[PDB]
Structure formats: structure tokens, C-alpha cells
Amino acid sequence: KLALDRMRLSTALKKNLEKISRQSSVLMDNMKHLLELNKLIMKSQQESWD
Amino acid sequence: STKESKNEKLKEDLEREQRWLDEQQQIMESLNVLHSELKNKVETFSESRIFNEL
């Protein structure tokens, strides 16, 4: 059921980000904040492991 | 917030176990020189020395 849900969410985000809509002006900022927080979690995980 | 505080705990833990390794090596270098002085002083003063000194 989780695999069917993640495939429907992956096709829903693919049809979302295929066409440029009006929610992209906050969705691009949300993806930039998530990639900066994930880069901080990568550097923290590497330094904590070493 | 809970992993950077885990990093700030472990940098405090980087000081303490390095100090605890420095204390345990200071035990280890002092127990080596007390084992060498005890092996060199197995033979004590003689039985005939105590009668003539007293």
C-alpha cells in the first residue's frame, strides 16, 4: 500500500512539475530550503562518523 | 537541532576521553617503572647485615 502511494505521489509530482504553475514560486523555495538542510545533515553525518 | 547538539556533545566527549587516555597512559608509564624497580629489588637486605648494623 505504501509502494502504491509512493508511485501515485511520484506521478502526481511528475505531472505537477511538468507544467509551470503558480505554486512553483513557493515550491522552488521549499526545495531550496530542503536541499540546504539536507546538505547540513550530510556534513554533520560525515563529521560525526569520523 | 538534536544532531548538532549531538555534535556539540561529542566535541565535549572528544576532550574527555582524550584526557582519560592521557591519564591511563600516565598510569601505564608509572606502573612500568614501578614494575622495573620491584624486579630489581627482589633481593632485600641480608640476614647477617641486620645483626651487625644493630
Short mmCIF file of N, CA and C in Angstrom, two decimals:
data_model
loop_
_atom_site.label_atom_id
_atom_site.label_comp_id
_atom_site.label_asym_id
_atom_site.label_seq_id
_atom_site.Cartn_x
_atom_site.Cartn_y
_atom_site.Cartn_z
N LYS A 1 0.82 -1.21 0.00
CA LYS A 1 0.00 0.00 0.00
C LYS A 1 0.86 1.26 0.00
N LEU A 2 2.00 1.23 0.70
CA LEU A 2 2.94 2.35 0.70
C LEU A 2 3.66 2.48 -0.64
N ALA A 3 3.89 1.37 -1.34
CA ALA A 3 4.51 1.42 -2.67
C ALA A 3 3.54 1.97 -3.71
N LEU A 4 2.25 1.62 -3.59
CA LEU A 4 1.22 2.21 -4.47
C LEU A 4 1.02 3.70 -4.19
N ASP A 5 1.11 4.10 -2.91
CA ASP A 5 1.03 5.51 -2.53
C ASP A 5 2.23 6.32 -3.01
N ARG A 6 3.45 5.76 -2.95
CA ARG A 6 4.62 6.50 -3.40
C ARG A 6 4.71 6.55 -4.93
N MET A 7 4.16 5.53 -5.62
CA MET A 7 4.08 5.62 -7.08
C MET A 7 3.03 6.64 -7.54
N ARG A 8 1.90 6.74 -6.83
CA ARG A 8 0.91 7.77 -7.17
C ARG A 8 1.38 9.17 -6.81
N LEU A 9 2.13 9.32 -5.71
CA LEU A 9 2.75 10.61 -5.38
C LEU A 9 3.88 10.98 -6.33
N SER A 10 4.61 10.00 -6.87
CA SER A 10 5.67 10.28 -7.83
C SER A 10 5.11 10.71 -9.18
N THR A 11 4.02 10.06 -9.63
CA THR A 11 3.36 10.50 -10.86
C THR A 11 2.60 11.82 -10.67
N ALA A 12 2.11 12.09 -9.45
CA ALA A 12 1.44 13.36 -9.17
C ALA A 12 2.44 14.52 -9.14
N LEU A 13 3.62 14.30 -8.56
CA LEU A 13 4.66 15.33 -8.62
C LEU A 13 5.30 15.46 -10.00
N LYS A 14 5.29 14.39 -10.81
CA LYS A 14 5.78 14.49 -12.19
C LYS A 14 4.82 15.30 -13.06
N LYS A 15 3.51 15.07 -12.92
CA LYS A 15 2.54 15.89 -13.63
C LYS A 15 2.38 17.28 -13.02
N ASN A 16 2.78 17.46 -11.75
CA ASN A 16 2.85 18.79 -11.16
C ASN A 16 4.01 19.60 -11.75
N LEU A 17 5.22 19.05 -11.75
CA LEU A 17 6.40 19.77 -12.20
C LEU A 17 6.67 19.64 -13.69
N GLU A 18 5.78 19.00 -14.45
CA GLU A 18 5.84 19.08 -15.90
C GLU A 18 5.46 20.45 -16.44
N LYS A 19 4.40 21.06 -15.90
CA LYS A 19 3.93 22.37 -16.35
C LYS A 19 4.16 23.38 -15.23
N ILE A 20 4.66 24.56 -15.60
CA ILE A 20 4.94 25.64 -14.65
C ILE A 20 3.61 26.24 -14.20
N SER A 21 3.34 26.17 -12.90
CA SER A 21 2.11 26.67 -12.31
C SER A 21 2.43 27.83 -11.36
N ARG A 22 1.40 28.30 -10.66
CA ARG A 22 1.53 29.42 -9.73
C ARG A 22 2.02 29.00 -8.35
N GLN A 23 2.07 27.70 -8.06
CA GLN A 23 2.56 27.23 -6.77
C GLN A 23 4.07 26.97 -6.80
N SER A 24 4.69 27.12 -7.97
CA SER A 24 6.13 26.94 -8.16
C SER A 24 6.97 28.00 -7.45
N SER A 25 6.42 29.20 -7.22
CA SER A 25 7.16 30.29 -6.60
C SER A 25 7.39 30.07 -5.11
N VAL A 26 6.59 29.22 -4.47
CA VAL A 26 6.89 28.76 -3.12
C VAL A 26 7.43 27.33 -3.09
N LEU A 27 7.14 26.51 -4.12
CA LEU A 27 7.63 25.14 -4.14
C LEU A 27 9.13 25.07 -4.43
N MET A 28 9.63 25.99 -5.27
CA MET A 28 11.06 26.08 -5.55
C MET A 28 11.86 26.57 -4.34
N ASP A 29 11.29 27.50 -3.56
CA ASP A 29 11.89 27.94 -2.30
C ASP A 29 11.88 26.85 -1.24
N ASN A 30 10.81 26.03 -1.20
CA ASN A 30 10.75 24.90 -0.28
C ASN A 30 11.77 23.81 -0.64
N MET A 31 11.99 23.57 -1.95
CA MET A 31 13.00 22.60 -2.36
C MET A 31 14.42 23.12 -2.14
N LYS A 32 14.62 24.44 -2.23
CA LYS A 32 15.93 25.03 -1.92
C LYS A 32 16.26 24.97 -0.43
N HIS A 33 15.25 25.22 0.43
CA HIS A 33 15.45 25.06 1.88
C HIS A 33 15.66 23.60 2.29
N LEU A 34 14.98 22.66 1.62
CA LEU A 34 15.19 21.24 1.91
C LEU A 34 16.56 20.74 1.44
N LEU A 35 17.07 21.27 0.31
CA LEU A 35 18.40 20.83 -0.13
C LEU A 35 19.52 21.46 0.71
N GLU A 36 19.32 22.69 1.22
CA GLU A 36 20.32 23.28 2.12
C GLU A 36 20.33 22.60 3.49
N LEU A 37 19.15 22.24 4.02
CA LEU A 37 19.08 21.48 5.28
C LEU A 37 19.62 20.06 5.12
N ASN A 38 19.43 19.45 3.94
CA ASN A 38 19.99 18.12 3.71
C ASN A 38 21.50 18.16 3.50
N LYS A 39 22.04 19.26 2.95
CA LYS A 39 23.50 19.42 2.84
C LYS A 39 24.15 19.61 4.21
N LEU A 40 23.46 20.33 5.12
CA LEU A 40 23.91 20.44 6.51
C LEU A 40 23.84 19.10 7.26
N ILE A 41 22.84 18.27 6.96
CA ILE A 41 22.74 16.95 7.58
C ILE A 41 23.80 15.98 7.03
N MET A 42 24.19 16.14 5.74
CA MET A 42 25.30 15.36 5.15
C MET A 42 26.65 15.71 5.77
N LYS A 43 26.93 17.01 5.97
CA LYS A 43 28.20 17.42 6.58
C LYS A 43 28.26 17.06 8.07
N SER A 44 27.11 17.14 8.77
CA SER A 44 27.04 16.73 10.17
C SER A 44 27.19 15.22 10.34
N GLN A 45 26.64 14.43 9.41
CA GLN A 45 26.76 12.98 9.46
C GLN A 45 28.18 12.52 9.15
N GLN A 46 28.87 13.19 8.21
CA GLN A 46 30.26 12.85 7.88
C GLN A 46 31.23 13.20 9.01
N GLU A 47 31.06 14.39 9.62
CA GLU A 47 31.92 14.79 10.74
C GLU A 47 31.63 13.98 12.00
N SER A 48 30.36 13.59 12.23
CA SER A 48 30.01 12.77 13.38
C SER A 48 30.51 11.34 13.23
N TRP A 49 30.52 10.81 11.99
CA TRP A 49 31.04 9.47 11.75
C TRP A 49 32.56 9.40 11.90
N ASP A 50 33.27 10.43 11.42
CA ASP A 50 34.73 10.46 11.53
C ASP A 50 35.20 10.67 12.97
N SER B 1 18.53 20.12 15.08
CA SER B 1 18.77 20.65 16.41
C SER B 1 19.21 19.56 17.38
N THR B 2 18.87 18.30 17.10
CA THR B 2 19.27 17.22 18.00
C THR B 2 20.51 16.48 17.52
N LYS B 3 20.96 16.72 16.28
CA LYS B 3 22.21 16.13 15.82
C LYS B 3 23.38 17.09 15.93
N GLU B 4 23.14 18.40 15.80
CA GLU B 4 24.21 19.37 16.06
C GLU B 4 24.48 19.50 17.55
N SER B 5 23.46 19.27 18.38
CA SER B 5 23.70 19.15 19.82
C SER B 5 24.36 17.82 20.16
N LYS B 6 24.16 16.80 19.33
CA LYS B 6 24.94 15.57 19.44
C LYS B 6 26.38 15.80 18.98
N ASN B 7 26.59 16.71 18.02
CA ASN B 7 27.95 17.10 17.65
C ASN B 7 28.61 17.96 18.72
N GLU B 8 27.83 18.82 19.39
CA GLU B 8 28.40 19.65 20.46
C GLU B 8 28.62 18.85 21.74
N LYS B 9 27.89 17.74 21.90
CA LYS B 9 28.19 16.82 22.99
C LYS B 9 29.44 16.00 22.69
N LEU B 10 29.65 15.62 21.43
CA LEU B 10 30.75 14.72 21.09
C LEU B 10 32.08 15.47 20.99
N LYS B 11 32.05 16.77 20.69
CA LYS B 11 33.27 17.58 20.79
C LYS B 11 33.66 17.81 22.24
N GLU B 12 32.68 17.85 23.14
CA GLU B 12 32.99 17.79 24.57
C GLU B 12 33.45 16.39 24.97
N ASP B 13 32.96 15.36 24.28
CA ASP B 13 33.43 14.00 24.53
C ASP B 13 34.75 13.72 23.82
N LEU B 14 35.14 14.57 22.86
CA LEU B 14 36.45 14.43 22.24
C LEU B 14 37.55 14.92 23.18
N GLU B 15 37.20 15.83 24.11
CA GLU B 15 38.18 16.32 25.08
C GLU B 15 38.37 15.33 26.23
N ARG B 16 37.29 14.69 26.68
CA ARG B 16 37.31 13.99 27.97
C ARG B 16 37.95 12.61 27.86
N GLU B 17 37.61 11.84 26.82
CA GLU B 17 38.24 10.54 26.64
C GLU B 17 39.66 10.65 26.10
N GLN B 18 40.03 11.78 25.48
CA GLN B 18 41.43 12.02 25.18
C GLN B 18 42.20 12.35 26.45
N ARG B 19 41.54 13.01 27.41
CA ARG B 19 42.13 13.22 28.73
C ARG B 19 42.15 11.91 29.51
N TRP B 20 41.16 11.05 29.31
CA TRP B 20 41.13 9.77 30.00
C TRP B 20 42.11 8.77 29.40
N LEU B 21 42.44 8.92 28.11
CA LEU B 21 43.51 8.12 27.52
C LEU B 21 44.87 8.65 27.95
N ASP B 22 44.96 9.96 28.21
CA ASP B 22 46.20 10.55 28.68
C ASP B 22 46.45 10.22 30.15
N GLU B 23 45.38 10.00 30.93
CA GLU B 23 45.56 9.58 32.31
C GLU B 23 45.90 8.10 32.40
N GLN B 24 45.30 7.27 31.53
CA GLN B 24 45.51 5.82 31.58
C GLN B 24 46.90 5.45 31.06
N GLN B 25 47.43 6.22 30.11
CA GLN B 25 48.82 6.07 29.69
C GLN B 25 49.78 6.56 30.78
N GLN B 26 49.35 7.55 31.57
CA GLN B 26 50.16 8.02 32.69
C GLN B 26 50.14 7.03 33.85
N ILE B 27 49.06 6.25 33.97
CA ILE B 27 49.07 5.08 34.85
C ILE B 27 49.99 4.00 34.28
N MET B 28 49.97 3.82 32.95
CA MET B 28 50.71 2.74 32.29
C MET B 28 52.21 3.01 32.27
N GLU B 29 52.61 4.27 32.15
CA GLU B 29 54.04 4.59 32.20
C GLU B 29 54.57 4.62 33.63
N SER B 30 53.69 4.79 34.62
CA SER B 30 54.14 4.79 36.01
C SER B 30 54.11 3.39 36.60
N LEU B 31 53.25 2.51 36.09
CA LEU B 31 53.26 1.13 36.55
C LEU B 31 54.36 0.32 35.87
N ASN B 32 54.90 0.81 34.75
CA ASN B 32 56.07 0.17 34.14
C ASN B 32 57.33 0.43 34.95
N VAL B 33 57.51 1.66 35.45
CA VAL B 33 58.73 1.98 36.18
C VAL B 33 58.66 1.51 37.63
N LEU B 34 57.46 1.21 38.14
CA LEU B 34 57.36 0.58 39.46
C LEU B 34 57.47 -0.93 39.37
N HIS B 35 57.22 -1.50 38.18
CA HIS B 35 57.49 -2.93 37.98
C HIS B 35 58.97 -3.18 37.78
N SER B 36 59.69 -2.21 37.21
CA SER B 36 61.12 -2.37 36.98
C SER B 36 61.91 -2.19 38.26
N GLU B 37 61.45 -1.31 39.16
CA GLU B 37 62.11 -1.14 40.44
C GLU B 37 61.77 -2.25 41.43
N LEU B 38 60.65 -2.95 41.23
CA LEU B 38 60.31 -4.07 42.10
C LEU B 38 61.02 -5.34 41.65
N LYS B 39 61.26 -5.47 40.35
CA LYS B 39 62.02 -6.61 39.83
C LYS B 39 63.51 -6.47 40.14
N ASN B 40 64.02 -5.24 40.19
CA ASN B 40 65.40 -5.01 40.57
C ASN B 40 65.63 -5.06 42.08
N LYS B 41 64.56 -5.01 42.88
CA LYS B 41 64.70 -5.08 44.33
C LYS B 41 63.95 -6.28 44.89
N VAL B 42 64.11 -7.44 44.25
CA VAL B 42 63.60 -8.69 44.81
C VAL B 42 64.46 -9.10 46.01
N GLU B 43 65.78 -9.06 45.84
CA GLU B 43 66.70 -9.31 46.94
C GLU B 43 66.73 -8.10 47.87
N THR B 44 66.38 -8.32 49.13
CA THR B 44 66.36 -7.29 50.16
C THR B 44 67.72 -7.25 50.86
N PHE B 45 67.78 -6.59 52.02
CA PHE B 45 68.98 -6.59 52.84
C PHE B 45 69.18 -7.97 53.46
N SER B 46 70.45 -8.32 53.69
CA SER B 46 70.83 -9.66 54.10
C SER B 46 70.51 -9.90 55.57
N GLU B 47 70.51 -11.18 55.95
CA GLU B 47 70.21 -11.57 57.32
C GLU B 47 71.38 -11.25 58.25
N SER B 48 72.61 -11.39 57.75
CA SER B 48 73.80 -11.04 58.52
C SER B 48 74.06 -9.54 58.56
N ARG B 49 73.42 -8.76 57.69
CA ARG B 49 73.58 -7.31 57.73
C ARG B 49 72.81 -6.69 58.90
N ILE B 50 71.65 -7.26 59.23
CA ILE B 50 70.77 -6.73 60.28
C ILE B 50 71.38 -6.97 61.67
N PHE B 51 72.14 -8.06 61.83
CA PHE B 51 72.76 -8.36 63.12
C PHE B 51 73.96 -7.46 63.39
N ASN B 52 74.73 -7.12 62.35
CA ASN B 52 75.93 -6.32 62.56
C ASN B 52 75.64 -4.82 62.56
N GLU B 53 74.56 -4.38 61.92
CA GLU B 53 74.23 -2.96 61.93
C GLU B 53 73.57 -2.56 63.25
N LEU B 54 72.73 -3.45 63.80
CA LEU B 54 72.08 -3.16 65.08
C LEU B 54 73.03 -3.36 66.26
#
